[PDB]
Design a binder for this molecule. Structure first.
Ligand SMILES: C[C@]12O[C@H]1[C@H](O)c1c(cc(O)c3c1C(=O)c1cccc(O)c1-3)C2=O
Ligand SMILES: C[C@]12O[C@H]1[C@H](O)c1c(cc(O)c3c1C(=O)c1cccc(O)c1-3)C2=O
Ligand code: NA
Lengths: 293, 293
């Protein structure tokens, strides 16, 4: 393989993490687990893998039994034809942790994984001790207000939200070329490019480089219309909620969570644009430790 | 594989066309000309070349001296570092036809080329006998209202408007793979895919497949902020204006032309989505012949 296997990556971490799989509802999920204490489910997003949490997993494992998953369609997990709505991907994770003998878990999610974390809390409150959303709120009607063009100096264009709606073309252009996508994303977020090194970037590129892998990634985005419909039906979250927001999304995240939950806490990742677990790991680990207790 | 040279393509058409070049302001432009009568400048768009007008050029040449150009950055023309705002590209064409000894010309443009035709009329009214805009209005403030997401019911994702704003990534993803881009575009427009054959698609792909060619194409889109600023300064067009609009863009084109011009005629290409010269050549040729007279 071009990059180290997940088994090797897992072993390279302090804290005795191990790479595993579990089959839930016919979908085989890959995850890495380790540490001792109450269960903590960590959910990554696009275009990343469980490896995105590499910087905070050892600190977290000191207090929690960490379970860092690859979503349906992601990394070492199966890439089925459908079920890429966040409600369904949340049910995967619910089945996973219940299968591992946990009645309720702490949950933290980032990017697409944050949407799943929120859907997890909304659909399975009894299995949700507390939930943390990193940067990304669940889709709602505001998604329909995203603009194609920004006036100069007024923000970053969310081009991938449009491009990933497409059939066929995304896998045709991006297969074998995902390192370029990853580099663009990081060029437009990281304050210092060395925050994510060459090999880690290639670990992600390897995960997404097959046509099937690119395609599965796009399904997360194409499911937005369904996600928005589902969001309208959700009741208010009553368990403790944490929002950690970067400089660009903090206010929006605060507004949406406060309207969607009764018990909200906010932490500002003041030096981050989007990739919180990689941009400010100590702030993220500390916030999660403080919040989950 | 390789495609015919522009000279072979030009000679392949009925009506005695010849492939030529002219250098204006240090920029060498490629164009194909033929026919007899008052001059008619034909301007294509993205990701196409002068060859987009092949279906209408013989008919038009029976009445006009046709001049079908490759824009700055397009096909056989030079690809300089800058000058891809529509005002500058129109000045290129103005210099071209003046250099060829024409005081005034008929002008028709499609897609990006329609923007250029409009700018030609706005900046060089004395050199503009009449102007025809095919499908695409000049950028204005409404460009900033384009939405990334459409509800599952309506139209096509305007993904290319967002994607082509990017630095580096477009040439990185699209080099050598433009045939897939072209196939996607046609899959989402032509009523019958045979309207644009394999060889024609490959002629376009050949023009755009190198990184520098992809890059030049994106410059037309990146210049949008400048184009919008320029549009704000334009007075109303007073020479005769024709808008030919595809079935779904007709109302928007009519509304915009009517607000920006005093003497507007409209023709509907009721069976077309966007590529008017290829989808409904008889409508396009007939409309231009009637209008230019
Ligand atoms: C669900 C997701 O659309 C995915 C994407 O991963 C995403 C999201 C938000 C961003 O603000 C954002 C990105 C993203 O790739 C990115 C790169 C650089 C700057 C920046 O601001 C971003 C998201 O929530
Ligand atoms: C300036 C330009 O943005 C360029 C693009 O070439 C463009 C434009 C309009 C379309 O409606 C349109 C396209 C385009 O590629 C396309 C493909 C399939 C359907 C469809 O409708 C379109 C434009 O005017
Ligand atoms: Na695809």
């Amino acid at each position: 393989g071009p990059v180290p296997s997940d088994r090797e990556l897992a072993r390279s971490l302090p804290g005795g993490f191990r790479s595993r799989h579990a089959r839930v509802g016919g979908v085989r999920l890959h995850y890495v687990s380790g540490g001792h204490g109450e269960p903590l489910l960590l959910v990554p997003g696009w275009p990343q893998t469980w490896w995105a949490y590499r910087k905070v997993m050892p600190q977290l494992a000191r207090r929690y039994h960490v379970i860092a998953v690859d979503l349906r369609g992601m990394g070492g997990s199966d890439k089925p034809a459908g079920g890429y709505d966040k409600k369904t991907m949340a049910a995967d994770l619910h089945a996973l942790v219940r299968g591992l003998g946990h009645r309720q878990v702490n949950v933290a999610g980032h990017d697409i994984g944050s949407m799943v974390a929120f859907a997890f809390a909304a659909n399975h409150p009894e299995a949700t001790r507390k939930v943390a959303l990193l940067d990304t709120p669940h889709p709602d009607q505001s998604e329909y207000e995203m603009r194609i063009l920004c006036r100069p100096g007024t923000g970053t264009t969310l081009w991938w939200w449009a491009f990933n709606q497409l059939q066929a073309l995304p896998e045709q252009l991006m297969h074998g070329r995902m390192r370029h996508v990853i580099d663009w994303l990081y060029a437009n977020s990281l304050a210092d490019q060395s925050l994510v090194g060459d090999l880690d970037r290639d670990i992600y590129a390897n995960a997404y480089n097959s046509p099937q892998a690119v395609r599965a990634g796009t399904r997360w985005f194409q499911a937005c219309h369904q996600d928005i419909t589902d969001q309208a039906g959700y009741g208010k979250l009553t368990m403790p909620v944490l929002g950690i927001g970067g400089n660009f999304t903090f206010e929006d995240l605060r507004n949406k969570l406060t309207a969607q939950a009764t018990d909200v806490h906010m932490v500002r990742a003041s030096k981050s644009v989007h990739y919180l677990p990689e941009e400010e790991p100590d702030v993220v680990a500390g916030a999660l430790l403080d919040f989950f207790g």
